[PDB]
Amino acid sequence: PLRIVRAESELSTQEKSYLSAVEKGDYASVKLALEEAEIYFKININCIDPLGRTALLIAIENENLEIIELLLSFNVYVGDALLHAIRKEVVGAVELLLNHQFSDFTPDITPIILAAHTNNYEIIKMLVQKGVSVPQPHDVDSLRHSRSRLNIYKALASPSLIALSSEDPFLTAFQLSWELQELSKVENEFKAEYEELSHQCKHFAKDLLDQTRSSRELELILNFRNELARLKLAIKYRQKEFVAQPNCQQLLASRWYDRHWAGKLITCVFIGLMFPLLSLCYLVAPKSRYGLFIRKPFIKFICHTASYLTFLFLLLLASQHIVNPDRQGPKPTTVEWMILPWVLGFIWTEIKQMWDGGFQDYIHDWWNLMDFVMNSLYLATISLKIVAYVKYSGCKPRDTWEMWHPTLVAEAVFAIANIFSSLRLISLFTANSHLGPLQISLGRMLLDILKFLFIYCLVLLAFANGLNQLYFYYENSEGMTCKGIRCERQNNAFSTLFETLQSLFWSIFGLISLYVTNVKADHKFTEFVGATMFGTYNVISLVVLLNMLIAMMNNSYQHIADHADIEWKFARTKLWMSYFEEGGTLPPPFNINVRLNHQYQEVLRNLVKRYVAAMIRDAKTETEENFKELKQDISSFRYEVIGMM
């Protein structure tokens, strides 16, 4: 291939040496070369090197100010040299250039936007002192509309710009991080950059809060605008990093608690034993001796837990044979009368919580829909019982009752209802330092299981269709007192769709025998086909499908368990803050700013000053701290030699 240089040109025979002299830093040579004032021998001071660098821009690349000033005194064309100086972070070049078609910068980029991008405190302050404004973020050439919007959000989300041009940096970081998270859902092509921009805004608030020196400052930041008003505001904005901070966690634990392994469980049990004593004491007389003792959040939490374990006890005692035979339409027993106050209290709590939020963010969590289902089932149970009591009477053998009888449905719904009641108790694991992180990371990897169900159910339906279509013409019901696969002799596994759908579910656990594929005829070809499809379903679901469900759970457990302490602490503080107020200090069985601104801003000014100091004066080292030491030595040598002669 006889190659050639396509679409280019040649610069000159003279200006090459001038560019070389500019590069080498020779002051005299480039001074005499430029002395062709108004009479030039066809040498352009605006020559462009083959890589696009210009003589003015070459001096910027070495941040050597003497030739910069010499060139500026001859009115060389700048165009965008200020942007280059800002991008390369040279204070002297920006100072000099601030008072005096091809561009490698996007046309909507302004010097302030790029300066905020570089996160250099000095240049941003220098530009702000002159007076600038970034367009507000608030469609024909959509490629540059999204790029322009992204650029101004990156400049807005910079710690340097926020620290010197915000009324309240603790508030402009909460809102801007919130809208950056929700803006990554409407622009899915740039979701990896919008969400990584919001994550850096959450770190800014935590770092700003890390600069507190005394507990006097910390309690004043979180109490701004009844108690812990700003701390609850951070929880609303999902600021996990800000909330899970050791200095504020210590204060929160001090409020919560207001000893060894065998010295704490025993006293917890001892306190929990007399649950109904300092609950009636509260109603009788709210005195400091007993009425105010339950006001401690730790004591209140224990009272609500022991009162719930008591409910689970006589719930287990209602299935005993000791406590109304097999009679039709019976009256409630003595256990159910004791059960009723707990159900009524739970329903009252759910009712008073229902209108407190208006079903927004109230039913969206998983720990409220289950409760709603539980109370709905309990209400259905009591309604069915009271309906059956007034329209049914007389002692009749239980075997003779027709199915769908109201009593049978009532007890079935009651049996279903109390399974959820006992499973709800797993939500208390988040208060223990050992089962807390394990349970939080347990329900977070569970969301990845829900996506394999969408393919498992499709495979199940696909195989059930074929099995039913093959076997639906061989069903029989003579000589069979019992019918189905839930029988001693399974006979009709694949006769109907409803039976085929559940005979394939029980085959995962190996509870379906191999003779259910036989028909009462000498048809060996169809039997073999049915057995082959059953075995193929067994192979796919148990050797392939379920083998790769665990193959990703450990590969997704790695990401979940990375930051598994922040999420657990957020859950624990959410649990804690629900016991800090008045209104819930009654277990369900027994329930049936002129100067404030002054102080806040004077503290915040010091906090911001410490943050910016630690960010600029303590980050030059993070190797680069000794690079300027050699420059200082060389400059001192040069000054001494020049001044001596």
Ligand X SMILES: Cn1c(=O)n(CCCO)c(=O)c2c1nc(Oc1ccc(/N=N/c3ccccc3)c(OC(F)(F)F)c1)n2Cc1ccc(Cl)cc1
User: Rule CB under 6 A: which residues touch ligand X?
Assistant: 528, 531-532, 535-536, 539
Query: Has 632 been labeled as part of a binding site?
Result: no
Which of a second copy, ligand X, none interacts with 347 (beta carbon under 5 to 8 A by kind)? Answer: none
Residues in a beta bridge with 54? 48
Binding-site residue total for a second copy (CB under 8 A)?
A: 34
Q: Which residues of 16-42 are buried (b: 16+ CB within 10 A; e: fewer)?
A: eebbebbbeeeeeebeebbeeeeeeee
**Among 11, 14, 24, 469, contact with a second copy (rule: CB under 8 A):** 24
**Among 7, 37, 143, 641, contact with a second copy (rule: CB under 8 A):** 7
16 φ, ψ (degrees, to nearest 5): -65, -45
* Cβ within 8 Å of residue 482, ≥6 positions away: 488, 489
Task: Find the residue with minimal CB distance to ligand X.
Answer: 535
Distance CA 221, CA 604 (A): 8
Does 641 bind a second copy (CB under 8 A)? Our answer is: no
Query: Has 360 been labeled as part of a binding site?
Result: no
String marking each residue 149-188 x if it binds a second copy according to CB under 8 A: ------------x--xxxx---------------------
Q: Which residues of 371-398 are buried (b: 16+ CB within 10 A; e: fewer)?
A: beebbebbebbbebbeebbeeeeeeeee
Which of ligand X, a second copy, none interacts with 633 (beta carbon under 5 to 8 A by kind)? Answer: a second copy
Binding residues for a second copy restricted to 592-621, rule: CB under 8 A = 605
Does 383 bind a second copy (CB under 8 A)? Our answer is: no
* Amino acid at residue number 266: I
Q: Which residues of 502-519 are buried (b: 16+ CB within 10 A; e: fewer)?
A: bbbeebbeeebeeebbeb
Query: Has 326 been labeled as part of a binding site?
Result: no
Task: Using the minimum distance from each CB to a second copy, give the nearer residue, 4 or 143.
Answer: 4
Report whether 339 contacts 314 (CB < 8 A): yes
Does 555 bind a second copy (CB under 8 A)? Our answer is: no
Which of ligand X, a second copy, none interacts with 531 (beta carbon under 5 to 8 A by kind)? Answer: ligand X
Which helix (H) or strand (E) segment holds residue 99: the answer is none
Task: Using the minimum distance from each CB to ligand X, give the nearer residue, 542 or 566.
Answer: 542
Distance CA 50, CA 43 (A): 17
Task: Using the minimum distance from each CB to a second copy, give the nearer residue, 164 or 268.
Answer: 164
Does 632 bind a second copy (CB under 8 A)? Our answer is: yes
User: Between helices 594-616 and 169-183, what is the axis angle to 10°?
Assistant: 70
Report DSSP letters for 219-236, one per residue.
HHHTT----SHHHHHHHH
Count how many residues are written for the chain.
645
Distance CA 47, CA 50 (A): 10
CB of 130: closest distance to a second copy in angstroms? 10
Does 552 bind a second copy (CB under 8 A)? Our answer is: no
Task: Using the minimum distance from each CB to a second copy, give the nearer residue, 125 or 304.
Answer: 125
Does 5 bind a second copy (CB under 8 A)? Our answer is: yes
Q: Quick one: CA dihedral 319, 322, 328, 332, positive or negative?
A: negative
Query: Has 371 been labeled as part of a binding site?
Result: yes
Binding residues for a second copy restricted to 74-133, rule: CB under 8 A = 125, 128-129, 131-133
Which of a second copy, ligand X, none interacts with 182 (beta carbon under 5 to 8 A by kind)? Answer: none
Which of a second copy, ligand X, none interacts with 104 (beta carbon under 5 to 8 A by kind)? Answer: none
Place of tokens 């503290």: 603
Place of tokens 């004043």: 220
Task: Using the minimum distance from each CB to ligand X, give the nearer residue, 63 or 527.
Answer: 527
Q: Residue numbers of the site for a second copy (CB under 8 A)?
A: 1-8, 24-28, 125, 128-129, 131-134, 136, 161, 164-167, 605, 632-633, 635-636, 639-640, 643
**Which residues define the annotated binding site for Ca(2+)?**
350, 353, 368, 371
